[PDB]
Amino acid sequence: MEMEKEFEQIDKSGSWAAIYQDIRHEASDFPSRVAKLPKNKNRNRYRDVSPFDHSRIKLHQEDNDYINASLIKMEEAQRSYILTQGPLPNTVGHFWEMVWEQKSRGVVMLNRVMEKGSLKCAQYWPQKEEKEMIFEDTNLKLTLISEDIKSYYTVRQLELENLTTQETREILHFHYTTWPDFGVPESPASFLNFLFKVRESGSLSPEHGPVVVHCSAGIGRSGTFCLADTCLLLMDKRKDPSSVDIKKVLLEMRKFRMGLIQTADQLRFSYLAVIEGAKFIM
Ligand SMILES: Cc1sc2ncnc(N(C)C)c2c1C
Ligand SMILES: Cc1sc2ncnc(N(C)C)c2c1C
Ligand SMILES: Cc1sc2ncnc(N(C)C)c2c1C
Ligand SMILES: Cc1sc2ncnc(N(C)C)c2c1C
């Protein structure tokens, strides 16, 4: 079926939970043996969210190459994304090592450091120009260059230096700051505006390594971001945009990381975002 009318048909019939459970039943199951090794317990935020072995990002290290991060490679859309958990106190150096080694231009953050009164990720970037951060375990230096605070999101320019080679690179930090503590946003308008700002920066384009996107577990809000981006790109590329099947795209993405889209409300919100977004593109 088309999307917008499939949408109203699920609303009128109140069957979002049943649709979402079907997706959960059909999703791929691949091994994640490296994630479950005992030496990696303090590298995982949640025991039930792990990268598959076949798609995990490897650190360029011989001691321990493990990080909780996955490469989502979308062949028809010609887009790739790295989805990862919010960094932990003992993985902030690994996180920036990955950004460096994968040649990423942008980092997309969809959570606040504290939500619901608890810490959802480490304070992994510097908050003042004159107070830079040094990650001694991976030999990197990170400096805040500029910050632009808007009503729904903040954009930061960061300098990452590889202290071993003295090479430097500019990284863009795109921080969506207004996702509610509970539920999903009422309108997709600010989320779509944010997606378009990431696109306009070059961070999603083939001349750079894959964008790094995270929330707390790296599957819910993060899944919504890449699902909406890929569906909108396919609607532009195909002769028949009504042929784009958001459930089929989501199942393809779930071949590369488990659990993408965590609730039926996030599934409905993803439909809403693609539907409204397709009208603005034209
Ligand atoms: C006026 C300019 S030039 C420039 N180059 C890189 N990053 C920037 N941000 C997002 C702060 C800027 C701004 C705000
Ligand atoms: C002159 C340039 S280059 C560039 N790259 C990314 N974003 C931009 N804007 C609009 C915030 C710009 C602008 C305004
Ligand atoms: C040279 C660059 S990169 C970039 N990314 C996001 N916003 C920006 N602007 C318009 C403030 C910029 C600028 C000016
Ligand atoms: C939903 C939105 S916001 C926005 N801002 C600038 N350009 C856009 N297009 C057409 C690429 C969009 C779209 C499609």
Curated annotation (Swiss-Prot):
**GO terms (BP aspect):** actin cytoskeleton organization; cellular response to angiotensin; cellular response to fibroblast growth factor stimulus; cellular response to hypoxia; cellular response to nerve growth factor stimulus; cellular response to nitric oxide; cellular response to platelet-derived growth factor stimulus; cellular response to unfolded protein
State any GO CC term: glutamatergic synapse
Modified-residue entries (S-nitrosocysteine), positions = C215
List the catalysed reactions.
O-phospho-L-tyrosyl-[protein] + H2O = L-tyrosyl-[protein] + phosphate
What does the record say about PTM?
Oxidized on Cys-215; the Cys-SOH formed in response to redox signaling reacts with the alpha-amido of the following residue to form a sulfenamide cross-link, triggering a conformational change that inhibits substrate binding and activity. The active site can be restored by reduction.
Residues that bear Cysteine sulfenic acid (-SOH) = C215
Q: How does it sit in the membrane?
A: Peripheral membrane protein
So which tissues is this one expressed in? Expressed in keratinocytes (at protein level).
Q: Where is this cross-link: N,N-(cysteine-1,S-diyl)serine (Cys-Ser)?
A: C215-S216
User: Which top EC class applies here?
Assistant: hydrolase
**Enzyme Commission no:** 3.1.3.48
Q: State the UniProt keywords alphabetically.
A: Acetylation, Endoplasmic reticulum, Hydrolase, Membrane, Oxidation, Phosphoprotein, Protein phosphatase, S-nitrosylation
- Places the protein is found: Endoplasmic reticulum membrane
| Result when mutating C215S | Catalytically inactive mutant; abolishes sulfhydration
The organism sits in which domain of life?
Eukaryota
Residue numbers bearing the N-acetylmethionine modification: M1
Assembly, in brief, is:
Interacts with EPHA3 (phosphorylated); dephosphorylates EPHA3 and may regulate its trafficking and function. Interacts with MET. Interacts with NCK1.
In which family does this protein belong, per the annotation? Belongs to the protein-tyrosine phosphatase family. Non-receptor class 1 subfamily.
- Function statement: Tyrosine-protein phosphatase which acts as a regulator of endoplasmic reticulum unfolded protein response. Mediates dephosphorylation of EIF2AK3/PERK; inactivating the protein kinase activity of EIF2AK3/PERK. May play an important role in CKII- and p60c-src-induced signal transduction cascades. May regulate the EFNA5-EPHA3 signaling pathway which modulates cell reorganization and cell-cell repulsion. May also regulate the hepatocyte growth factor receptor signaling pathway through dephosphorylation of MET.
Q: What is this protein called?
A: Tyrosine-protein phosphatase non-receptor type 1
Species assigned in the record: Homo sapiens
Mind giving the lineage of the organism this protein is from?
Answer: Eukaryota, Metazoa, Chordata, Craniata, Vertebrata
Shown residues in whole-protein numbering = 1 to 282 of 435
